[PDB]
C-alpha cells in the first residue's frame, strides 16, 4: 500500500500550512515588501477573518513603515485593538480566548491545562 510523500499532508488539508513559509521584514524594505508583511500579519494575527477597509489600523502600520516599530511591536499593536478585542475576547470565554491567543501569537496549540491556568 503506497502513499505519495505528502499524502498525509493532503489528507487533513494541512498541505498549505504544514511546513509554513515565514515572512520577514528586511532592511530598506520596498513599498511592496511591507505591504506583504502587513497582508500576512493580518491573516495570521487577526483570525483568518475578513478585515474590511474600515477595520484596518492606519496608525500602527504607518509606524511599521519608517521602522519606528518592529514587526514584533506591530503585532502587539494589532493584538491590543478594539478590533482584536471585539472579535476574540469580548464574545469569548477566557478558555476560548487563551486557546485562540495560542495559535495566532504562536502556531502551536496549548500543550497542557496548566498553561491555560
Amino acid at each position: 500500500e503506497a502513499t505519495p510523500d505528502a499524502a498525509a499532508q493532503t489528507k487533513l488539508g494541512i498541505t498549505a500550512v504544514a511546513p509554513d513559509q515565514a515572512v520577514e521584514l528586511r532592511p530598506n524594505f520596498g513599498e511592496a515588501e511591507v505591504q506583504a508583511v502587513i497582508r500576512a500579519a493580518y491573516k495570521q494575527i487577526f483570525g483568518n477573518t475578513y478585515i474590511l477597509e474600515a477595520d484596518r489600523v492606519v496608525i500602527a502600520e504607518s509606524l511599521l513603515r519608517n521602522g519606528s516599530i518592529s514587526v514584533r511591536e506591530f503585532v502587539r499593536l494589532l493584538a491590543k485593538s478594539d478590533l482584536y478585542r471585539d472579535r476574540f475576547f469580548r464574545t469569548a470565554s477566557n478558555n476560548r480566548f487563551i486557546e485562540l491567543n495560542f495559535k495566532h501569537f504562536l502556531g502551536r496549540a496549548p500543550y497542557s491545562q496548566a498553561e491555560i491556568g
Binding site: 474590511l52 477597509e53 474600515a54 477595520d55 478585542r85 469580548r90
Partner: protein, 162 residues
Amino acid sequence: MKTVITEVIASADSQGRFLNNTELQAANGRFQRATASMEAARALTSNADSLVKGAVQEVYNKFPYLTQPGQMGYGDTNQAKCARDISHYLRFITYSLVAGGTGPLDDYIVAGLREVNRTFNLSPSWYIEALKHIKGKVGSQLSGQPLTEANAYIDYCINALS
C-alpha cells in the same frame, strides 16, 4: 455594538475590575441625554416617508442626467432601490439615537460601505445630497438638544460616506 453602556462595561472588563464611580458617571451621561435623543427619534420616525421622497427627489435635481435613459437613475427599479436605500440610512439613524451610540450605524451602514459602493458604482455624492437635504428639513421639525443630536448622527454618515 458600540454604545456608551457597552463601552464602559468593556473598559471595566478589560482591566478586570468592577464598575467603579468612573464608569457610572459616564453611564449617567447617556441616560440623561436619552430624553432628548428619544424625542428626536419620534420626530424622524413620523416624518420618515416625506423626508425620503424629498431627498430622492433632490438628488435628481442635483444630477439631472441620472434620469436620462441608459443611466442609473433611470427606470423605476432603480428609483425604488434609491428610495429603499435612503429609508435604510434613516432607519439606522433613528436606531442610533435610541441606542445612544454610533454602534448601529457603524455595523449596518459603514462597515463595508466603500467596497459595496465601488463594486456597484454607487457614487457617494448622491447619498450625501440625500442626507444634506434631509438635515435641512429636520432643521425645522426639531430644535435645541433634540436637534443637535439628530445632526450629530446625520453628519457622522456624511463623513463616513465622504
